[PDB]
Design a protein around this ligand. Sequence first.
Ligand code: 9L4
Lengths: 11, 229
Amino acid sequence: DHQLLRYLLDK
Amino acid sequence: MELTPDQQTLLHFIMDSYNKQRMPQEITNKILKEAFSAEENFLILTEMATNHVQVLVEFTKKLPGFQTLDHEDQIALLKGSAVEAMFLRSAEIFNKKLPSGHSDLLEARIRNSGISDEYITPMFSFYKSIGELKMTQEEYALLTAIVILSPDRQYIKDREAVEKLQEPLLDVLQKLCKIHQPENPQHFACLLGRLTELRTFNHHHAEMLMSWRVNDHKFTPLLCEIWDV
Ligand SMILES: O=C(O)c1ccc(NC(=O)[C@H](C2CCCCC2)n2c(-c3ccc(Cl)cc3)nc3cc(F)c(F)cc32)c(Cl)c1
């Protein structure tokens, strides 16, 4: 759902 | 009364993270330089807001205890504060001291950027009410942190974990309000009171963007996730 947000968060 | 060594360490660390943002002068120089079309301004907005989200995620990750929180609550806090944080940041830049006539020209250029008349008055009313507080850079940095770590945000599973991270930031801001404005003991509550007017912008951000005088409202995949447009 919030793929990019999750990606930027888990980096 | 006075900040403790731990609070002073916290304040300096929040300030370093907050200073990693796009320079306010860069933003205002561009708007004041030349008038752009509603299509040109929509694109400037789209680029500025995408970069802001990126900077906001980095600022948030550095907030003490944030990375120890449940991953889904982390996403819920970010989604819940992104729009508010951009309007608070826009409010900061709008109230920065400029040479004679510049602020009136800045307001006039924003008033004619493409946004609908319906949203111009609630927006400038919020900005001017922010300006009346005569906030310091530290007060803006702490208030942004406080806005992000809001326990009463929707979809949050563990509110008390968020509460514990927001409480030390609220105490630091309270101490600063007493030091910076000793004549006005209401200042802290006045500052907190502005957060409720910030929350109203979440209800009508999507409309505010779709009502922009442009033929096509093209956003970035990151803005589509954060804004729900
Ligand atoms: O540090 C950052 O990352 C950052 C800083 C500022 C902004 N805000 C903008 O860029 C837009 C611009 C967009 C282009 C046309 C004119 C307004 N903007 C707003 C504003 C209006 C409407 C909406 Cl829906 C959102 C913001 N209110 C403003 C008040 C101002 F003092 C200012 F300098 C710009 C302002 C963003 Cl995005 C990031």
